[PDB]
Design a protein around this ligand. Structure first.
Ligand code: NA
Ligand code: NA
Ligand SMILES: [Zn+2]
Ligand SMILES: [Zn+2]
Ligand SMILES: [Zn+2]
Ligand SMILES: [Zn+2]
Lengths: 212, 212, 212, 212
């Protein structure tokens, strides 16, 4: 399925759309392409559009970063074991917000550290206001490994490898989770990509490789 | 923003699309409509299409059920505090898979209970195969409260209220989480809906109301 | 180490204590017996006392039920990989509160369902008062599989097997988690028990076996 | 209850024990002192001993660091709402392992980064061996804020304030969690302490104050 989606993405990058934006009528719950995609929530990604998926073809799982965390695994388990998908595509992307902050800064700002509160405003260009209380949850914001770059910075080699390392960790999480079959007759297959938000083109991430 | 999106959805339901499926070119990370949408991963939902959002306008957060769990809160915190959104829309939907199983059945099937394994096959119409091992994570599959109905069953009053109760719980989670400002000068506003996958039309969920 | 602790427990059950309750003076952080124990928080368990451990000998990890959940795994990973333990003992126990409620009842009572609120009072014999709001966390209360029995009910065959099944699931979680080595030259070994709070005696749980 | 426990701790520090280490016979599940204690799993802490609690008097919740995380909240909710406790004591302690590593180092070592693997061996003085795979869980190891000190280093002002800040964050988590009543007629009260493992004496942490 997926090389065909990469060709749809080549068209998309070149200025030709493939997704049909109208309502498809009544459909069954099982994704017809037997695919699940995990992508960032970033507004610049329309996952169906950039892959040329049609409505009804794939599960679309999206969170901050497109990270493979506990919820992503919950989703993938349901997708495969209950709803019959057997392929997974990861779509991280360039200029991702998860490159631009650290867990501890945001935590401290929310808790009420005045320095962290000020620093987050400086990093974001908005008037961040502390909650002034601590929380146990969420336990982790899952910012990408590495020191932060400016928010929405243009691409670079260094940031591409930081994004790619996060993709590789997600591939390893899926390929070693006890409740996802990625070998034998019920197996799932998985590939990971980085979407360039400015060009519209996907590039594939190597696996195995370094993971953060 | 949102009543305009409901009008786009009225068009969508009636057979007229509003989302433009081509690449929009270079854009900034901040969602231009300052909106975050949390929806189910169900393949029959194209969130941008059914709301008439354009690429670049909204964060799109999607998981099994569109539930407000720890990851959804992680996403919303980033969306608002770092990326300046201030409105949230919840889109649960009809014929959702989260109406059709229970946490304990799926857990036991994955663990290797032969009865549960067989029962999940009967419920799903696929050859479910146990992992044969236990896992601590995910801690909860977050199936909707109430006894399970058949997978992909047509709408009913009872199931509409089960979906609506889950939407109300998600609204309450957001409106009482320590790290989401939903009052005062940094506040976020939130509304919840059920998307009818067969008609293409949204219906709004009342709040406050019963929560499961 | 552990058969010696079982002999200390035989003494304890018979009315002879082995733990020394005074301060042992300065000690190193590494547990001297290279053991970690995971037990219920139940007030009737003094883990050091019932095993005849001395202060400084073992990590003592305790939560509601003694369940192997994400935090228990966090603890065990630190215990072994950083602090050199290589044996794990699970101590579930009789008359455990985790036999007496269900996740959904407590959730609904906390959310504000008036029926659930009343029912929890009836089950607990205390004036339970709803919080009147929903929360994403904790995602699961981890009550033992099976229908609830009365709070603090005396032992039975049925409840012993419900406790034992939870112990077996915890053993399977540990023995299949990606980040706990339970084979090869860095391996950890693990055994599981039920502590009888009334007699003071441990009984060992079979493994492999049914897991809930 | 708690000032009496502090006097028992003064005796303990001075070389006089108060906890009785034998089996107390049959007891009810409700902690008789209506207290829950959250402490580190560190082997040098025997919580009942250092507070002079008797078996049956208090819930004893223990994890790496004594941190207030999602599981600690799960435990406290059960403790109060089902089992009638209404006081909480936090016991962090000196020379805690959570002062000596960072989440990202341990994650990377477990994932298989050879540099991180080597560095963890150097920090711990043991032969740390990578798992060679990624995991989504545990999402956070919850090392204390601040740069790492040597494992099991002697006390200092700087490390005392790092421990105290973690205690204050835990107090704030409890005092702002939606499902713990810490005001009104069902309220819980809470105090936080640092246990000196070398002297045996507790010292109380100020609240409100800085939180990491
Ligand atoms: Na779309
Ligand atoms: Na003890
Ligand atoms: Zn992103
Ligand atoms: Zn759904
Ligand atoms: Zn128990
Ligand atoms: Zn410690």
């Amino acid at each position: 399925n997926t090389d065909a989606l990469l060709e749809n993405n080549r068209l998309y990058a070149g200025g030709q759309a493939t997704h049909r934006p109208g309502h498809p009528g009544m459909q069954p719950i099982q994704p017809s392409r037997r695919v699940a995609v995990v992508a960032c929530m970033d507004a610049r990604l329309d996952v169906e559009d950039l892959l040329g998926l049609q409505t009804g073809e794939a599960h679309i799982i999206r969170n901050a970063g497109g990270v493979i965390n506990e919820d992503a695994i919950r989703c993938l388990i349901i997708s495969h074991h209950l709803l019959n998908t057997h392929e997974i595509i990861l779509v991280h992307h360039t200029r991702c917000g998860m490159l631009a902050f650290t867990d501890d800064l945001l935590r401290a700002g929310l808790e009420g550290d005045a320095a962290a509160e000020k620093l987050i405003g400086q990093a974001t260009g908005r008037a961040f206001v502390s909650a002034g209380k601590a929380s146990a949850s969420p336990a982790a914001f899952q910012a990408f490994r590495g020191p932060p770059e400016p928010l929405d910075a243009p691409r670079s080699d260094a940031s591409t490898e930081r994004i790619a390392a996060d993709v590789r960790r997600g591939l390893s999480i899926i390929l070693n989770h006890p409740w996802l079959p990625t070998a034998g007759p019920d197996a799932i297959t998985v590939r990971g990509f980085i979407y360039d938000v400015d060009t519209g083109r996907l590039e594939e991430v190597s696996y195995p490789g370094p993971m953060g």
